[PDB]
Amino acid sequence: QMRLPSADVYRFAEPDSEENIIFEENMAGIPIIKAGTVIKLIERLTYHMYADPNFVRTFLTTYRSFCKPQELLSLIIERFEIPEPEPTEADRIAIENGDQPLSAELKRFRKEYIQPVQLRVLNVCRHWVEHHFYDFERDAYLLQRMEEFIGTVRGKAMKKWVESITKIIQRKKIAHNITFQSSPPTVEWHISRPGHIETFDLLTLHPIEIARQLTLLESDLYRAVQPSELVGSVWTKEDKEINSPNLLKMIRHTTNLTLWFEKCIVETENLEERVAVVSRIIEILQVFQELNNFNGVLEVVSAMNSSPVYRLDHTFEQIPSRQKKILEEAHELSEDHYKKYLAKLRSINPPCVPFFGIYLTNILKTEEGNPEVLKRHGKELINFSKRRKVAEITGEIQQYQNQPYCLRVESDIKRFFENLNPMGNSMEKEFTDYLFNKSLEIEPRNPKPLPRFPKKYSYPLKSPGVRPSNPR
Template sequence: VVEDLSAVELDPDLLLLLMELVFCLLVGGELGPAHQLHSNILSKMEKRWKLISSPQSLCPLAAKGVAARPGTLLDFRSQDLAEQLTLLDSELFHKIELPEVLLWSKEQNEERSPHLTRFTQHFNSVSFWVRSVIILQDKAQEREKLLLKFLKVMKHLRKLNNFNSYLSILSALDSAPLRRLDWQRNTFETLEEFSSLIDSSSSFRVYRTALAEVEPPCIPYLGLILQDLTFVHLGNPDTLMTSEGSNVNFSKSWQQFNILDTLRSYQQVRYSLQPDSDIISFFNDFSDHLSEEALWELSLGIR
């Protein structure tokens, strides 16, 4: 049945059902059929990925004698990928308004914090896109190449002070579906080294120190800023009772102001980067990714 499906027909919902079937076959001891079905699924998903990733304008450009853009992630320079990730992040980051950040620490209302919500969704989309790009490779060698490619991109993101995409990719590479697979020892050690930046010990001391030392432009990791604001909000009352009655808790307001003022300082300086239409088209708004369930099922099918 899978062999008769076109690449377009194999959508995420159908993929999840098929991977559940693979799992049932494995549990039932039907190793041969399970392996064959898994191989067919991966082959179809690879074709679907290439089909989705290909720009609609590729044929017309080639017909005009214009060089077609690269077709896979490995064809792009790591620095260029990092710069375009930063440019996309920056466009969303500078739209965020400080009041919606403060509001989010109190009630997490997506409708009242639209720009912050879009920025957060973008972070998650990039992360799941990275996982999908790697997990859809049938061969371990190809998965290894892509993981190393993303590590190189992260290196350039760090130079650009883009902690947002840096941590988005890191969350992908350190996710359960990828972490459980076999990797070369030096690859794993490099990933561990990159992970040290976001070590949660001592209230993320390593990351906070690195952030404090950067010269803008910079895109911070908003997750920690929101966490800090939430702690301030929950740990301090809005008013204090004194002998004169109820007064505004200026200490709480001052802490909130300092956090938001630091965020504002990062928004005041922009990157001088130029958009690359080929790479941005290749990213396709990072919408071509699998669900968490589908990623896990594919990972289980690999070994």
């Protein structure tokens, strides 16, 4: 085999035991760790035998539930100072004959234990700095310690990586091109012409461009959500506005857009006009589906499923047959706990904008339905399978966050939607009550007969359709 240092000078040499590390039954084929002590977890995070860069992500994403950032740094620095072995018998004999020792064993342990383990400690350091930098912003003593650690690493072996990490740390202290093969489609205009932001509305913007700008907007919002806003279920806790501002900004955009769809519908009192309005919205839903904007799809589906909109039977009697079919397909994505949606998501060709809600529910229940620790033989092991499960979720998310949309921003339409505020100065209950009342006004309950209302739109109600055009 190969000899390790003493467990009395190097804590990470303790033999594996069911009192310090438990493996998942199934198997690449590297072992999957079910539970372990922090010591054992950090040993495996930087094991000498095999690579597992996925383990590096899982660990750096979820470690704070069981070990503080300063403690982590201390233990990897400890892991990094591996003591060298004493010369062997062969070696001793040559030194007392005035020869140079072969140092075979020492040279092997350096190449097969020390070098891999130190390289993987530096790897944890690189990733921790590149992708989890917030630990350092919130604790500058921690950043000093890291900077010092990197800056005291001598040895030409580690020379290239030490310089690199130093540079990366410096970039992050003081602070993203995109390249497409193809060129984006032409921005499409309807009644509202470019620059005329005063006239922008649901019916006057081109429905194709409404879906696209909302999709750029919603994609950006999705891509900004960091795993720190997710781990610990912190978005549901008292300080959610502090810890999860991007996630909340995005959920909030979704709710505004849904409530805006509702408002547009129930505030169009004339039946024929309201039918045009509902119709256009389903058109926007269609372009959302084309763009794989699943958040956008659900925005529309939620609007249609809402209390004041669902009951408008006279309005939906008059929707074209093709559009009933579209709203039905879309609604069905959510049936059986989002079964068809999940199937569709895991089957499309990105870019896409997932629906973030599924993720929040799974992370939360995962954190809540598995124990922090496993007790074996009186000992307490960190329950790591729980942590790997949360990381698979944050991983899914991060994965859909990479691919950008090949679409042109139109700044004015972008501003228009960023500033959308359907509720005005009203609180959510009183605005929600208003919407439902307006719904009662425009189509009363049976058996009250259906009133008539005057038209409100001066411009044409004909949709220009959802098929892109193309001059040049």
